[PDB]
């Protein structure tokens, strides 16, 4: 008990070029404090991409989404007990 | 209709368990401020409760339901409005059988 478990999240498939898109990384259980780490295609993460982290959730914001942003994004959440993680694909229709 | 708000679609995870925390984010993909956000449950304005918490950011909203119970099962709607238009989504908070 005490280790984090993340709320499942996937990017919607109806996002369109130029829109702002966000991913939320947040536990459904787990002791605090919590550490949040974001990766894109396996590597750590540009003015148009922002990370805002709070006590028990972290928000990745990709503004004016475009070809430069397509890829797989991972959030790893950690506390003193262990970690959880999810990965979700950001793809957009051909405008 | 330039300036009108549009929401990022959001759906609760389909398999929730009693006791967990669950959150819904209501965040705009486009639009001009000022924006106003509201939440409904089963079509009625969402009432404040000790473990039902609406967080207000500068231009988005977050609903946090702690210790999910059968009390919380229902259909939740977020509506965003401004001078130029409105948008909304609805998602069901469900506890399916184990």
Planar angle of CA B49, B36, B41, nearest 5 degrees: 35
CA distances from B25 to A1, A80, B37, B61 (A): 27, 27, 11, 6
Distance from CA of B95 to the nearest CA of A (A): 14
Out of B8, B9, B13, closest to residue A7 by CB = B13
Domain range list for chain A:
1-95
Peptide bond into A33 cis (omega under 30): yes
Rounded to whole angstroms, the Cα distance separating B39 from B53 reads: 11
- What is the CB-side half-sphere exposure of residue B13 using CA atoms within 13 A? 17
SS3 (DSSP) at A67:
helix
B1 by Cβ neighbours in 10 Å (0-12 / 13-18 / 19+) ranks as exposed
- Substitution target from B4, B8, B22, B35 for chain A, most A beta carbons within 10 A: B8
Resolution of this structure in Å: 1.3
Residues sharing a CB contact under 8 Å with residue B70, sequence separation 6 or more, in sequence order = B18, B95
Per DSSP, which regions of A1-68 are E strands?
A: 5-6, 21-25, 27-29, 35-40, 43-44, 49-53, 58-62
Structure tokens at B49: 């409760």
Method: X-ray
Residue A4 is given by DSSP the state: -
Residue in B with minimal Cα distance to A12: B9
């Amino acid at each position: 008990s005490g280790a984090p478990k993340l709320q499942p999240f996937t990017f919607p498939k109806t996002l369109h070029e130029g829109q702002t898109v966000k991913a939320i990384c947040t536990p459904t259980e787990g002791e605090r404090p919590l550490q949040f780490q974001w990766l894109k295609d396996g590597h750590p993460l540009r003015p148009l991409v922002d990370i805002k982290t709070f006590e028990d959730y972290s928000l990745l914001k990709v503004s004016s989404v475009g070809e430069k942003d397509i890829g797989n994004y991972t959030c790893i959440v950690r506390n003193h007990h262990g970690s959880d993680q999810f990965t979700t694909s950001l793809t957009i229709p051909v405008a």
